[PDB]
Amino acid sequence: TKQHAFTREDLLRCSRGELFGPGNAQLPAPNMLMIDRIVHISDVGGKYGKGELVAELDINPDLWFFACHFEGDPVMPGCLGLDAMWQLVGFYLGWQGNPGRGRALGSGEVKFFGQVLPTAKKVTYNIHIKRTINRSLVLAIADGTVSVDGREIYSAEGLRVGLFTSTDSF
Amino acid sequence: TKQHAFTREDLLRCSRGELFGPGNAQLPAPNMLMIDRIVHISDVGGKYGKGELVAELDINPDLWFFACHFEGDPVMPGCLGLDAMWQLVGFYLGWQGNPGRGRALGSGEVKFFGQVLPTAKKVTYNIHIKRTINLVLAIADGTVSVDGREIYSAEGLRVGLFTSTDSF
Ligand SMILES: Clc1ccc(CNc2n[nH]c(-c3ccco3)n2)cc1
Ligand SMILES: Clc1ccc(CNc2n[nH]c(-c3ccco3)n2)cc1
């Protein structure tokens, strides 16, 4: 809760289990990691007054997904930008100090109304936390947008991620 | 519309633009391709009477995503199983003979209530077409199952075809 920004190195450390500790939240490592840095994370402010994350993914044409998706028509998979939002929401829960491993639980409406081309510079994720529930299962609910070089292209309402001290029920 | 099942090699051919032709729908190539075969595709039947797809992805422990997602806790990314459903809905549109390149437009509710482990054998996707609109787009519900067990649902999956993605 004390640190409000994270470098790529921090996120890589997180992916090894070395930021939040063993048994607790881990981001994906590359090539599933869809964030380079967290520019701002807080548990006050945001659209709902319950916290906010802003994060960035640098784009260049040699990112692996461009060559296979699609041949002759390169474009960042929408599913991976969506996943970056789930990644942030999970991270948020770990960052608050909750224990357990992350699993996404889903979302309400998702809309894709733009795209990321290999000639783009930077994708930015804006996440507004709507609610956290610490009752027995720990989860978070949030709204999110994905933008590319200033232009909003995706929205998601009701992103949900949980933490599990035993994922055995999945 | 004439062929009701596709092998992996058909899907690869699709990924190269060589199934539906140039300017028309392409599946992703590996490693974004999340389907090995389409076991059944039709434009009648299904939950809504407007068509159906059943497809499969074989699982083994060496699939690339297991090692990085997550270290010490391998599990297929939910987003990729979701994407498989968008992949199938786009394919459907190309398979009907519509022109243009595919872009997913979103979904209504998505739920993940299970997971794919490296010890699973096979993932199966069931897609029920709800509506096509001829801008061309399709709307569908989908489920993802692993070795018989339903684990994800999506309602209102939407994919469109575009004869120009310059503007998108
Ligand atoms: Cl730090 C952090 C951030 C986000 C997450 C969640 N990511 C996630 N991917 N796939 C699933 C999933 C859910 C069910 C099946 O698969 N969940 C984990 C750790
Ligand atoms: Cl065959 C066939 C099947 C499915 C699709 C769509 N898949 C898809 N991934 N990412 C996007 C997208 C949408 C908006 C931004 O990115 N769309 C294309 C061809």
Numbering used by the authors:
A (entry chain B): 2 to 171
B (entry chain A): 2 to 135, 138 to 171
Task: Please give sentences taken from the publication describing this entry.
Unlike FabZ, FabA carries out a second enzymatic step, the isomerisation of (E)-2-enoyl-ACP to (Z)-3-enoyl-ACP (trans to cis C3–C4 double bond), an essential reaction to provide unsaturated fatty acids that are furthermore absent in eukaryotes. Further, unlike FabI, there are no isozymes of FabA.
To understand the mechanism of inhibition by N42FTA, we determined its co-crystal structure with PaFabA. Therefore, each dimer has two compounds bound. One nitrogen atom of the central triazole ring makes a hydrogen bond with main chain of A195 in the A subunit whilst the other two nitrogen atoms make hydrogen bonds to H70 and G79 in the B subunit. One water (W1), found in all five monomers in the asymmetric unit, bridges from the triazole to the side chain of D84 of the A subunit and the main chain of C80 of the B subunit. A second water (W2), which is absent in two monomers of the asymmetric unit, bridges the triazole ring and the amine of N42FTA to the key catalytic residues H70 of the B subunit and D84 of the A subunit. These data suggest that N42FTA acts by blocking acyl chain substrate binding.
